[PDB]
């Protein structure tokens, strides 16, 4: 995890809890669109604004690529399904890493 | 996959599909709750009384527990997103044997 973004990890991991929370009882269609604009809206209230998507942080962004990945198999049904747990694991190591370095 | 559950296997797809859909808006926490009640439901239904719960269908049964069993090692916010991930890909392989041998 790169240094610079080592101050942040606490703040994804309670948007992300936010974003997930928001798409928890959105239809089935509307979950990966109201996931994304809650993870947006909470990140950029929780850093202050020092970004506006979810897409700007570094390795975040490598965490969602991955997690999308993960879906191309995955029926749609279930695409949100799989995305959340692969980003939710991929969240938490980061947070690990972030509590044992600070 | 017991000659005598092809006949319905169809039918627990449909259920499923009606379960997971009333689950999907319901919040994290009521999740399997208004799942399980809404499966039974259904397939209590579509079966015309022939069965008045998952639990007792055989190869349905055989799955759920294996569904279950993929959410021990899942982080709490995820267990249902994994638990239904699983159940999905099961009963869709069900399906196609249904589709094949009949
Ligand atoms: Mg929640
Ligand atoms: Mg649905």
Chains 1, 2 share one sequence.
Do not use: H, R
Request: aromatic letters at 8%.
């Amino acid at each position: 995890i790169p240094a610079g973004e080592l101050q942040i990890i606490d703040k994804i991991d309670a948007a992300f809890k936010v974003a997930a929370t928001a798409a928890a009882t959105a239809p089935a269609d509307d979950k990966f669109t109201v996931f994304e604009a809650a993870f947006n809206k909470a990140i950029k209230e929780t850093t202050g604004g020092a970004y506006d998507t979810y897409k700007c942080i570094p390795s975040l962004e490598a965490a969602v690529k991955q997690a999308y990945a993960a879906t191309v198999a995955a029926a749609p049904q279930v695409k949100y399904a799989v995305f959340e747990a692969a980003l939710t694991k991929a969240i938490t190591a980061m947070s690990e890493v972030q509590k044992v370095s600070q």
